[PDB]
Design an enzyme around this catalytic site. Structure first.
Site, PDB file in Angstrom:
ATOM      1  N   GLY B  48       0.809  -1.198   0.000  1.00  0.00           N
ATOM      2  CA  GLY B  48       0.000   0.000   0.000  1.00  0.00           C
ATOM      3  C   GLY B  48       0.844   1.250   0.000  1.00  0.00           C
ATOM      4  O   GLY B  48       2.064   1.175  -0.074  1.00  0.00           O
ATOM      5  N   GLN B  53       3.743   9.796   1.946  1.00  0.00           N
ATOM      6  CA  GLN B  53       4.938   9.067   1.575  1.00  0.00           C
ATOM      7  C   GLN B  53       5.541   9.599   0.291  1.00  0.00           C
ATOM      8  O   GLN B  53       6.613   9.170  -0.109  1.00  0.00           O
ATOM      9  CB  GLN B  53       4.644   7.578   1.444  1.00  0.00           C
ATOM     10  N   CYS B 101       8.387  -0.996   5.350  1.00  0.00           N
ATOM     11  CA  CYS B 101       7.773   0.194   4.782  1.00  0.00           C
ATOM     12  C   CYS B 101       8.625   0.727   3.643  1.00  0.00           C
ATOM     13  O   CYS B 101       9.846   0.696   3.705  1.00  0.00           O
ATOM     14  CB  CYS B 101       7.588   1.252   5.869  1.00  0.00           C
ATOM     15  N   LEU B 102       7.986   1.203   2.587  1.00  0.00           N
ATOM     16  CA  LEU B 102       8.739   1.717   1.456  1.00  0.00           C
ATOM     17  C   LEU B 102       9.533   2.932   1.850  1.00  0.00           C
ATOM     18  O   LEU B 102      10.497   3.283   1.176  1.00  0.00           O
ATOM     19  CB  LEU B 102       7.805   2.083   0.310  1.00  0.00           C
ATOM     20  N   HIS B 143      -1.499   0.140   9.417  1.00  0.00           N
ATOM     21  CA  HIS B 143      -0.163   0.537   9.016  1.00  0.00           C
ATOM     22  C   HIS B 143      -0.224   1.766   8.143  1.00  0.00           C
ATOM     23  O   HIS B 143       0.594   2.660   8.267  1.00  0.00           O
ATOM     24  CB  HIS B 143       0.512  -0.582   8.224  1.00  0.00           C
ATOM     25  N   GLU B 144      -1.191   1.818   7.245  1.00  0.00           N
ATOM     26  CA  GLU B 144      -1.261   2.958   6.368  1.00  0.00           C
ATOM     27  C   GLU B 144      -1.984   4.177   6.906  1.00  0.00           C
ATOM     28  O   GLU B 144      -1.764   5.279   6.425  1.00  0.00           O
ATOM     29  CB  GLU B 144      -1.829   2.546   5.018  1.00  0.00           C
ATOM     30  N   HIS B 147       0.593   6.443   8.782  1.00  0.00           N
ATOM     31  CA  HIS B 147       1.314   7.412   7.972  1.00  0.00           C
ATOM     32  C   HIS B 147       0.611   8.742   7.938  1.00  0.00           C
ATOM     33  O   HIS B 147       1.230   9.782   7.765  1.00  0.00           O
ATOM     34  CB  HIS B 147       1.469   6.898   6.545  1.00  0.00           C
TER      35      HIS B 147
END
Ligand SMILES: [Zn+2]
Ligand SMILES: [Zn+2]
Lengths: 171, 171
Positions: B48, B53, B101-102, B143-144, B147
């Site tokens: 995702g 981000q 995480c990216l 998780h998203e 952010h």
């Protein structure tokens, strides 16, 4: 020669490293380790290095800087072999630094450590020391004894918000 | 096109992202963002992605997997646009996962999150949702949303001992 530096994730970096015997320092392979260790710490441009950082759980710490590129500001530090160290806080006052570690490449973290400690070690010679170190030196020494009890600076990060990569922190 | 993914250290990833207006979703540039976002999340092989981000503090989250190489085990996940989300824990039970995480490349960390949550969002369409998600989905969604409030998994790491690089964790 330069030994391969273990990176955060290897369970070795978390195991407790045991003491060195008065017998060992006079050993041949030991002298060959301090050689490697130094050779490795220099190639890495690090301020210091702990045995476990290369796979050896012996209480062996090395240090030395003189105009460092990885941590520009910091004062030059004089090479020294620190064995079977034992630090103790001499105050609650603390100096903050965005520490880094060769075992945790490309990142930096604000860490607040005591700024005045009492440390007692031993050298390649067998000499016994017991002084009180302060300032940057103390910082580095504490940072490196930590490695001996399986501790990395991330374990002390003042706060995860202040932790990240270099390429991004300076910007 | 693929937008540049911000890495941990950029203060943006820590700022609070504000809501999207019913006006925006029907906007032109917005549609162009969801495009990019998806294009970026895919090229990154991530499960995702959150707007911040990539430098945009809008409450926009994207997801979708289908046979992922970065997290082999995990179940395929169906693409979906999640807007102005609002999660709430429906239990104390928790499922553990070595999250990644990216924005925090090459590393993994064991993180224990609730395994059953109530989430309410909105889509590109403007539809209002309010279901209870469970299992891996919940994990990713939580998780998203994090952010969006400036939170990265490192802030929740069960314990720093269980955190490190991939190349080393699998070994
Ligand atoms: Zn280190
Ligand atoms: Zn992420």
């Amino acid at each position: 020669s330069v030994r391969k530096i273990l990176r955060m994730g290897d369970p070795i970096l978390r195991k407790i490293s045991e003491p060195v015997t008065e017998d060992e320092i006079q050993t041949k392979e030991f002298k060959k380790l301090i050689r490697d260790m130094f050779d490795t710490m220099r190639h890495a441009e690090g301020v210091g290095l702990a045995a476990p950082q290369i796979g050896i759980l012996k209480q062996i710490v090395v240090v030395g800087s003189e105009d460092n590129e990885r941590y520009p500001g910091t004062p030059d530090v004089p090479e020294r072999i620190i064995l079977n160290p034992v630090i103790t806080p001499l105050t609650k006052d603390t100096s903050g630094f965005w520490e880094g570690c060769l075992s945790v490449p490309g990142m930096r973290g604000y860490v607040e450590r005591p700024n005045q400690i009492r440390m007692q070690w031993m050298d390649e010679k067998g000499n016994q020391f017991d002084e009180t170190i302060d300032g940057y030196k103390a910082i580095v020494y504490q940072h490196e004894c930590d490695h001996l009890q399986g501790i990395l600076y991330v374990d002390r990060l003042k706060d995860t918000k202040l932790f990240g990569f270099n390429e991004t922190l300076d910007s």
